[PDB]
Amino acid sequence: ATAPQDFSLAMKKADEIYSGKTVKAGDIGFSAGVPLETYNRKVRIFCPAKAASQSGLGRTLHPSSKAPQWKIVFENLSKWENPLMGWTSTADPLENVGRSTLLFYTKEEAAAFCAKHGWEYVVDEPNPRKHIRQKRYLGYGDNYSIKRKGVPDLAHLPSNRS
């Protein structure tokens, strides 16, 4: 969260020095030269959640993470099995491009990219992660507190018994 203090410094500085000229939404998509039916596909802008198997926070939106984590992904299309060898066959050109290469630091960056190309997009915010322990086990001391069974009753004492 402090600073990477590496090549990323010059990367961010190059980012802030330079800027892009504003164009009408969708105009760049015509310049791209790809089939226009590509932009009929719908876009989901989301940040992956943490895998439950691992406890690392790199993939999550955390101050530790310094890598782009917002992906543009397209909706899943038909897949079938090769009759000869049972391989997974597809006709979707955009199957893996968004997952593999379309990574953005901020949600507004991905929204700007989609609006510039003309893709209709829906942004999904990650479920907030707050590292707050519950009151029962707020600290290590709470494990051996009197909360477990109450204050020890002293009615067993020989003086109190007698």
């Binding site: 203090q5 590496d6 090549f7 410094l9 010059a10």
Partner: protein, 60 residues
């Protein structure tokens, strides 16, 4: 090999120990041409040469 029973990567970790410092340069301060041409030879005798590096760095 002295690495068989003596394992310490953080001492021998050069990949993750690189950093970038920052400076600001301004046109107001004049350049030091004394550094560039004061050390330059004026006669053939004063010529100094940099020898070709024989080997690239190795850990040994």
């Amino acid at each position: 090999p002295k690495l068989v029973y003596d394992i310490k990567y953080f001492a021998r970790d050069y990949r993750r120990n690189n950093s970038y410092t920052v400076r600001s340069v301004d046109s107001k301060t004049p350049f030091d041409y004394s550094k560039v041409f004061g050390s330059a030879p004026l006669k053939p005798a004063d010529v100094k040469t940099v020898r070709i590096p024989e080997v690239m760095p190795h850990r040994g």
